[PDB]
Amino acid sequence: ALSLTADQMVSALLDAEPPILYSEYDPTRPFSMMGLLTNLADRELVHMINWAKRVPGFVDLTLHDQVHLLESAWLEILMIGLVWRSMEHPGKLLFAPNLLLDRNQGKSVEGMVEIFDMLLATSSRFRMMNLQGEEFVCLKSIILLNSGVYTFSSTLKSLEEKDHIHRVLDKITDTLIHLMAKAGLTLQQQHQRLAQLLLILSHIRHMSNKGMEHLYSMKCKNVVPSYDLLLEMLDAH
Numbered sequence: 001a002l003s004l005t006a007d008q009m010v011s012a013l014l015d016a017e018p019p020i021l022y023s024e025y026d027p028t029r030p031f032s033m034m035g036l037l038t039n040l041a042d043r044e045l046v047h048m049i050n051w052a053k054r055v056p057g058f059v060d061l062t063l064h065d066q067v068h069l070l071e072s073a074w075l076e077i078l079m080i081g082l083v084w085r086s087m088e089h090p091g092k093l094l095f096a097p098n099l100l101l102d103r104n105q106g107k108s109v110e111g112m113v114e115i116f117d118m119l120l121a122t123s124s125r126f127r128m129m130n131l132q133g134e135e136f137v138c139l140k141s142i143i144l145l146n147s148g149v150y151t152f153s154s155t156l157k158s159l160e161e162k163d164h165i166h167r168v169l170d171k172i173t174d175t176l177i178h179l180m181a182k183a184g185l186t187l188q189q190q191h192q193r194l195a196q197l198l199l200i201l202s203h204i205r206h207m208s209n210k211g212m213e214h215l216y217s218m219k220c221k222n223v224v225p226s227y228d229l230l231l232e233m234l235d236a237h
């Protein structure tokens with residue numbers, strides 16, 4: 001991972017991309033929103049594990065550290081994917097190709113329109129910056145590695161794990177800058193755009209926190225992936 005060139009980092013990320021999934025409803029039948037969005041999220045999570053395992057550096061970490069990082073990041077990862085899919089659909093959220101929803105559709109669940117609104121604004125910001133696919137994959141990998149890295153332990157192994165994570169992040173920063181130099185931006189423009197992109201990450205965190213509050217308020221054993229389910233899926237033979 002740490003020996004990859006910028007172009008090889010980019011190719012590895014683009015190749016790791018998960019598929020776009022569909023919602024499971026009978027489209028011949030009349031048009032619950034939360035059950036549909038929960039089922040979609042459950043299925044995406046499996047693919048997210050596969051993706052995370054292909055982000056360079058990720059499998060170099062301990063299984064316990066892989067679990068912690070996904071546990072911290074999984075709703076942010078789903079959200080950044082949604083915002084990206086929704087970028088060329090002003091005023092709508094493309095949860096799936098057969099489930100494109102507007103903000104009024106979110107009113108059907110108390111607390112949800114607020115979240116819908118924040119996600120639509122972030123998609124709006126992406127459109128204003130003209131975010132590129134290569135930039136988006138870098139940013140999603142940055143969420144995975146960064147979100148849980150401040151909440152681990154100071155065993156010697158933990159100290160080595162945090163160092164590695166920060167080295168892999170440094171390589172993604174290099175790759176982002178490379179992408180922007182290749183596009184022909186000036187050095188000033190490169191650093192300004194790097195900052196703009198990373199500051200949107202703060203908002204994506206905020207959104208995930210607000211959503212997790214909603215999910216925990218359902219008080220449901222079939223909602224939010226447990227440590228153990230994540231551990232079971234990541235602990236592959």
Ligand SMILES: CC(C)CN1CCc2c(ccc3[nH]ncc23)[C@H]1c1ccc(CCC(=O)O)cc1
Pocket residue numbers: 037038040041042044078079081082095115211212214215222223224225
């Ligand atoms: C209140 C928010 C958390 C609503 N979010 C907004 C982002 C999102 C959802 C579903 C599929 C998605 N695809 N891309 C993004 C995305 C939706 C949601 C709904 C239920 C769960 C529950 C999951 C479980 O209980 O295990 C998770 C996420």
